[PDB]
Design a protein around this ligand. Sequence first.
Ligand SMILES: CO[C@@H]1O[C@H](CO)[C@@H](O[C@@H]2O[C@H](CO)[C@@H](S[C@@H]3O[C@H](CO)[C@@H](O[C@@H]4O[C@H](CO)[C@@H](O)[C@H](O)[C@H]4O)[C@H](O)[C@H]3O)[C@H](O)[C@H]2O)[C@H](O)[C@H]1O
Ligand SMILES: *[C@@H]1O[C@H](CO)[C@@H](O)[C@H](O)[C@H]1NC(C)=O
Length: 426
Amino acid sequence: QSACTLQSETHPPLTWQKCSSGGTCTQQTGSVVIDANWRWTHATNSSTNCYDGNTWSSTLCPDNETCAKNCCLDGAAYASTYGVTTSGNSLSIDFVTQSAQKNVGARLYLMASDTTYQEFTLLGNEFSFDVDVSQLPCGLNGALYFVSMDADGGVSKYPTNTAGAKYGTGYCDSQCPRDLKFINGQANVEGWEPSSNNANTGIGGHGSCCSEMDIWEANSISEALTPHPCTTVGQEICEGDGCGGGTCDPDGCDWNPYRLGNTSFYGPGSSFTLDTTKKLTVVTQFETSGAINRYYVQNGVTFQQPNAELGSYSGNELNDDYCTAEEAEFGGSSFSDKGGLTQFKKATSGGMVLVMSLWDDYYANMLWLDSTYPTNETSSTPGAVRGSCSTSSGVPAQVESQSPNAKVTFSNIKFGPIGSTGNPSG
Ligand SMILES: CO[C@@H]1O[C@H](CO)[C@@H](O[C@@H]2O[C@H](CO)[C@@H](S[C@@H]3O[C@H](CO)[C@@H](O[C@@H]4O[C@H](CO)[C@@H](O)[C@H](O)[C@H]4O)[C@H](O)[C@H]3O)[C@H](O)[C@H]2O)[C@H](O)[C@H]1O
Ligand SMILES: *[C@@H]1O[C@H](CO)[C@@H](O)[C@H](O)[C@H]1NC(C)=O
């Protein structure tokens, strides 16, 4: 797809800190861009929509190639249309925003310039950020994560895509998402099927796969840390059912303190170690062995990831023994079939793009994160309970109606060698 300018594109600025092993941190200046799927896609020569609701224009988009040629992605009014705003090193995303249309959440990427994404090499380094999840009720997910996307959004590999990173193209993750309207410089209209419950989305014949590091997926009730390996490290297209776990691990080796047994660590109020009604700091370290360490800071008090005992595993580090014990006790073979932490280390050794989003779940109502899932299981089933939310929570239409003002705020992003981000920001 190409880019149009009926609406100017001005990326909300966002500062972050780059720290060094020497003990100092210096301020960096970037910005954020919204994913192409949220944009208005219309004819290059008019305002005629190429996509509207959950259907494509059969005239402008008879096939994937013709569609990409006839259509372009336009600019976004971040605040008024998408409820996305920034201030210094802080970024906020509102749940429901009413403009000429209703918009739900957003997915944003940190940029290095107005035409390129900022790439981060996680291995040997740590990522720190502050987050306020107080306005995130059951059913919502304020997420901060990394994915192995190309810095240019896919332009060099697929010339038919001239919009690039400036317009949020090139997404990919361990779920091999088929809801993307544009992949590899072509549309995804071929084989398109409208969602049964989301008036704005559908499923195309192709998907976009790649390694995904979910540093943070959470709301005020539950939080999870989850690495997702893929047999092909970077962005790669998939077709039909091949997208269903053919190359990527959609489940991952997840670490949810609540799911692992400590139901008093993360929650609303002073009855929890970390009070989710107030802002908190989350630091994640990627040691060279491939393991992942985590600690939190709130009101000046430091807490390492809480200890967990699962099978023969005991500790607070997300390592091979933990992931192996999890599949043995909770079930599944996806993570290990795809190479585990060894394969995932190939992703963190390379460059990954920072993603920040807010979403509700049309497939499983976010029950996998904050409730008992599947809903027919009980507390007696290992790993069934992930949070205190009712198994009846998270219905999109309901949370969108009852909590339109929900929002997540990410701030004070700091990146550098392990042990360096706790030093003074520059
Ligand atoms: C005896 O047979 C075995 O039984 C066990 C237990 O019943 C089976 O294991 C269970 O299988 C369930 C379905 O596969 C999963 S639910 C699964 O949970 C994961 C972890 O939360 C979810 O992954 C997350 O998905 C999010 C939304 O896409 C992502 O954003 C996030 O990054 C992912 O971590 C997934 O969506 C759910 O479907 C149980 O966890 C598991 O114990 C076993 O399969 C049988 O063989
Ligand atoms: C949860 O973790 C906190 C901090 O490590 C600890 O003080 C508390 O005892 C733990 N509770 C349980 C039930 O593990």
